[PDB]
Amino acid sequence: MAEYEEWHKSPVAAYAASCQATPGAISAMVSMHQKLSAPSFICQAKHRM
Amino acid sequence: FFVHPCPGARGSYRATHRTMVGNIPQPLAPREFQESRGAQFDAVTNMTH
Structure with a gap:
């Protein structure tokens, strides 16, 4: 394994x-x-995380 | 430091390294200081007793 992957x-x-x-x-x-995605941020900013 | 009495009749001053924090005496590193210095060893490593 290479740990940059x-x-x-x-x-x-x-x-x-x-x-x-x-x-x-x-x-x-x-x-x-x-998961640091852009539609992950929709989930937490809705729930105030 | 100490006094070295061997040559002739007079002495001269020599020195040995202390090699540790614990070889500093109690007037200059007291008992409650070494206790409060190892409790800072604990907070960084976050070891479990």
Whole structure:
């Protein structure tokens, strides 16, 4: 693998190595996979995220 | 620093490196400072005890 390609770049694994085990860090990972698209921004700005 | 008494009758001053933060004495790095310096080691690494 070359890590300039995959959906998980380097600073995703840099987050997992530095977490506490709190269940607030579980929902951080699901909130981490927002896709930075232009019609993704319509979804959060509607829901005020 | 210390005094080196070996040559002849007089001494001369020499020096050995302290090599650590902990080899600074307690008047110049007290007990509650080394405790509050390792609690800053904890907040950056974010280690789990």
